[PDB]
Design an enzyme around this catalytic site. Structure first.
Site, short mmCIF file in Angstrom:
data_model
loop_
_atom_site.label_atom_id
_atom_site.label_comp_id
_atom_site.label_asym_id
_atom_site.label_seq_id
_atom_site.Cartn_x
_atom_site.Cartn_y
_atom_site.Cartn_z
N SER A 107 0.89 -1.12 0.00
CA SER A 107 0.00 0.00 0.00
C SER A 107 0.92 1.16 0.00
N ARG A 108 0.76 2.08 -0.96
CA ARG A 108 1.67 3.18 -1.10
C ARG A 108 1.13 4.39 -0.42
#
Lengths: 62, 499, 56, 50
Positions: free
Chosen positions: B366-367
């Site tokens: 998850s950025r």
């Protein structure tokens, strides 16, 4: 023009075809009763159970 | 009744007026009619044939304007008036579309009467700029325990759902839609995510199943399903995500929240290939249309999280990409992976191994990460990320005479992995995500044997509901776990584990 | 509510650990818990008694 | 409710195919001729109104 012709023809010359409410009944789920009150009946009435229980398991609290 | 409605309809068509521009088809082949005429034609404008098929005019060529037919070839036949509709592709958008299954054009295909809509907005409008966008800051709880802890999803940031072919990719997505019911039902209008699911290239039977499933979980009432099915012509399939984005814009612009899940962009790509190659536009890498990176990038960047200046709206997006044999080096996956801002990588092996949802914990990222995740859930599951990491590394060592330390990891790790399974097509409230995860994290369930982990899970929930639904309600509403709350929780878990 | 009865019950369950006399006594408490948990979810599931004569 | 809606749909397609039968009758008539006159004057009115 053609609009008028169509309007005239459609409305006037044919309308709904037959269709009975009775025939509908077959295709739907009909109301049916919620049979039974479903009375529960008393369990373990009397000291018959109590005498049985006092005697039956004598396993003491540790 | 129906007679009255028809009478209204005949009355409701009126005589026309002189219609500017006309064409005559020069040759119509391959669903690419090429019309000679149409002197002033706006690029990408919708043009309507004599037959009644609609088309758009992707190529305006120097002497002929190459319309692409939105229906079967048979409809248009060489030489025939080609009327100019005169409005570039636009679809009805509005609050009123809520609960209707509509096709790419926007026509009601659900058959629940005319689509009442508040605007028609163009289907190619450019994405929110640098100054309009304000960084993500509101969690979106998908309700799957694994997604919500391992890979947090926040409002307004696209995250891919890239995974192996027919490993029930759609199921992972559909679960997200169901969980949104919990927030949706209420009265807090800064909580409702109004989802729109865009079924592109899926058989009509599959989309019928989708419709029924949504109705079954009583979820059509915040869903709009733009469906352009496998049968529908290749232009309709092409315009299907673009159209969908426009449906989303009403929500974003009017300041609601919404999540549009494009399923699956892999098939979107195939449709663009079909159009381009048939229009003889230059071929490119892996025989995919030349500007294919550009096409996908346009679609996916319409998602954004608007600034407080611009009404604080959002438009979360979740494209689904089908990886053919899991080869994530393939040109259409690679392009999309770059464009997106996160990945969830569903792995076929895991699916087979009974971990469903089958999120491969390692290869998902998850950025936007910690901006999302409910504050409570963040606190009690920072640990969860780290524990699983060790379990992965020490996984292969499960083939003898193993250190006590190694064995401790293995026990904790196996139990956690078993714990994170979620029964298909049922979401789980956030207020119960924080308790369940707490138990594993604090190691209470380490002792519980693997076969009983599942039984424990359901039991813990019932136990929490009976013993202290005060605790649960506090967890839900406070939304942040104070030391006192964590104290009460420790006790509760101790009590539960003891029984 | 029902939870008052049950809070005293489970406090008593972990006390009942400290009595070895139990045999099926804990199973009787477990049973009362089961059906108690059933009635609350029954009661929470509840439809409005009659169909809406307004809308429906 | 479900069958009631189905019956309305059934009505809509039934009266639709009956409309097709009236259309075949209309295109036979020398209304087919007389309405060309109507169109002729209508186009005269229209194109002069531009």
């Amino acid at each position: 023009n053609v609009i008028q012709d169509l309007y005239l023809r459609e409305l006037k010359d044919t309308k709904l075809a037959p269709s009975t409410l009775q025939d509908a009944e077959g295709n739907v789920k009909p109301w049916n009763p919620p049979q039974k009150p479903n009375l529960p009946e008393l369990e373990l009435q009397g000291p018959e159970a109590l005498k049985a229980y006092t005697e039956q398991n004598v396993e003491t609290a540790h | 009744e129906v007679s009255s409605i028809l009478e209204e309809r005949i009355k409701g068509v009126s005589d026309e007026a002189n219609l500017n521009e006309t064409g005559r088809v020069l040759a119509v082949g391959d669903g690419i009619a090429r019309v000679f005429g149409l002197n002033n034609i706006q690029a990408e404008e919708l043009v309507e044939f004599s037959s009644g098929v609609k088309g758009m005019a992707l190529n305006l060529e120097p002497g002929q304007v190459g319309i692409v037919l939105f229906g079967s070839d048979r409809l248009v036949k060489e030489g025939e008036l080609v009327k100019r509709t005169g409005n570039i592709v636009d679809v009805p958008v509005g609050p009123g579309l809520l609960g209707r299954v509509v096709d790419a054009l926007g026509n009601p295909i659900d058959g629940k009467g005319p689509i009442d809509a508040a605007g028609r907005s163009r289907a190619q409008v450019k994405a929110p700029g640098i100054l309009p966008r304000r960084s993500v800051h509101e969690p979106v709880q998908t309700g799957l325990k694994a997604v919500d802890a391992l890979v947090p999803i926040g409002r307004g940031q696209r995250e891919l759902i890239i995974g192996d072919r027919q490993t029930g990719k759609t199921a992972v997505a559909l679960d997200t839609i169901l969980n949104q019911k919990r927030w949706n039902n209420g009265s807090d209008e800064s909580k409702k995510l109004y989802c729109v699911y865009v079924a592109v290239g899926q058989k009509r039977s599959t989309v019928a199943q989708l419709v029924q499933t949504l109705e079954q979980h009583d979820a059509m009432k915040y869903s709009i399903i733009v469906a352009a099915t496998a049968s529908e012509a290749a232009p309709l399939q092409y315009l299907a995500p673009f159209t969908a984005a426009s449906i989303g814009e009403w929500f974003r612009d009017n300041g609601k929240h919404a999540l549009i899940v494009y399923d699956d962009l892999s098939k979107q790509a195939v449709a663009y290939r079909q159009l381009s190659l048939l229009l003889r536009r230059p071929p490119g890498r892996e025989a995919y249309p030349g500007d294919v990176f550009y096409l996908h990038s346009r679609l996916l960047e319409r998602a954004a999280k608007l600034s407080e200046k611009e009404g604080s709206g959002s438009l979360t997006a979740l494209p689904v990409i089908e990886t053919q044999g899991g080869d994530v080096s393939a040109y259409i996956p690679t392009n999309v992976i770059s464009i997106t801002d996160g990945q969830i990588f569903l792995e076929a092996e895991l699916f087979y191994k009974g971990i469903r949802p089958a999120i491969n914990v390692g290869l998902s990222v998850s950025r936007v990460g910690s901006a999302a995740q409910v504050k409570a859930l963040k606190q009690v599951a920072g640990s969860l990320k780290l524990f699983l990491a060790q379990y992965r590394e020490v996984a292969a060592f499960a083939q003898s005479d193993l250190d006590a330390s190694t064995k401790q990891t293995l026990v904790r790790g196996e139990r956690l992995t078993q714990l994170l399974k979620q029964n298909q097509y049922s979401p789980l409230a956030t207020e119960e995500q924080v308790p369940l995860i707490y138990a594993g994290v604090n190691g209470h369930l380490d002792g519980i044997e693997l076969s009983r982990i599942g039984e424990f899970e359901s039991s813990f929930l019932s136990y929490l509901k009976s013993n202290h639904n005060e605790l649960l309600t506090e967890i839900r509403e406070k939304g942040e776990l104070s030391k006192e709350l964590l104290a009460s929780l420790k006790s509760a878990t101790e009590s539960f584990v003891a029984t | 509510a029902k939870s008052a009865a049950n809070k005293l019950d489970w406090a008593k369950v972990i006390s009942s650990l400290r009595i070895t006399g139990s045999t099926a006594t804990q199973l009787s408490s477990f049973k009362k818990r089961n059906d108690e948990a059933r009635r609350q979810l029954l009661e929470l599931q509840s439809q409005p008694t009659e169909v809406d004569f307004s809308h429906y | 409710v479900r069958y009631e809606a189905s019956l309305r749909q059934l009505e809509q397609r039934q009266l639709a195919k009956s409309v097709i039968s009236r259309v075949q009758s209309e295109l036979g008539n020398p209304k087919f001729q007389e309405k060309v006159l109507q169109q002729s004057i209508s186009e005269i009115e229209q194109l002069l109104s531009k």
